[PDB]
Amino acid sequence: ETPAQRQARLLRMSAYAAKRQAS
Description:
35% helix, 1 helix, mainly alpha, 23 residues
């Protein structure tokens, strides 16, 4: 866990339009 990564998700993580990541 690190801000460099946390800020990435939060960049558009507001219950609006999910993310398309490999899973």
